[PDB]
């Protein structure tokens, strides 16, 4: 296999998904240089689980899944096994036995706009926590108390998604961050994704 893995279209995509509707790209039958990314000064997080980041280029996997979305700076800590909060609980959840890497970088230049970018959403309300790698894109009015809602927004009856408001001079904790989560999958099948 000579062809390079299409990481450019993952990391350099013009637009990223909302976290609640996080995107998944399957990577396979290709060669990828993880070290070039790890050793760059571009990322604020490059932290791996079940595998050493400095050993990634020596390994082969059956599939690599690249999940990507935007959150705000103070939420990057929630993208890890065992974490709690709105993002881990209701939006994107990693398993305890996660084998992969979490990669994040500040995206203020791209994802904020004067006047405010309000297109990136997260789920604020949900009945129960997501299971690992579960995705929820439903938009039913959430009942927060005893009175049924009958689909009517109101007191204790909340639309479940909420926009981030990304404006360029927000504090860093409230600036947008792009996140790529790589899942390294080893099946009972030949490996097709290796380093160089």
């Amino acid at each position, epitope marked *: 296999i000579t062809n390079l893995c299409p990481f450019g279209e993952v990391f350099n995509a013009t637009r990223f998904a909302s976290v609640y509707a996080w995107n998944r790209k399957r990577i396979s039958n290709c060669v990828a240089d993880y070290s070039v990314l*790890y050793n760059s*000064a*571009s*990322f*604020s*997080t*490059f*932290k*791996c*689980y079940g595998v*050493s*980041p400095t050993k990634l280029n020596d390994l082969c996997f059956t599939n690599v899944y690249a999940d990507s979305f935007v959150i705000r*700076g*103070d939420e*990057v*800590r929630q993208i*890890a096994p065992g974490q709690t909060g709105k993002i881990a609980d209701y939006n994107y959840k990693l398993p305890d036995d996660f084998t992969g*890497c*979490v990669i*994040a*970088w*500040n995206s*203020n*230049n791209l994802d904020s706009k004067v006047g405010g970018n309000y297109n990136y959403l997260y789920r604020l309300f949900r009945k129960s926590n997501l299971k690992p790698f579960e995705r929820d894109i439903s938009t039913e009015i959430y009942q927060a108390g005893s009175t049924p809602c009958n689909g009517v927004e109101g007191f204790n009856c909340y639309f479940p998604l909420q926009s981030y408001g990304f404006q360029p001079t927000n*504090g*860093v*904790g409230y600036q947008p961050y792009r996140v790529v989560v790589l899942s390294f999958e080893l099946l009972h099948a030949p490996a097709t994704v290796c380093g160089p």
Partner: nanobody
Amino acid sequence: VQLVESGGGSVQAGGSLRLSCAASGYTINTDAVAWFRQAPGKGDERVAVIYTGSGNTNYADSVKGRFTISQDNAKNTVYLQMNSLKPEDTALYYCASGYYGASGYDFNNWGQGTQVTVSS
């Protein structure tokens, strides 16, 4: 734990300044503190890192030899001393603390940012 930057301002090219990244608490989970800079037209750059236990330091090539990162654990503060400033050093500078170890790095506690302006 909250991070608060100070020391921002405006100086002319060739000049010098010092930024400070003051932490309110003292978390022991902080293995490293990083200074980033943000400017239009390019991705944010991690220009300097100091490892809290040893004081070892790593710099981006863009600032090596001109910037010095250091730390004072008694004040829970990390400094960035900037000499020989150039206009291309103009940026919003912001600090972060986080994990650094065998699993990689994860700068996930954020300051607010302070502007540095270098004028010809």
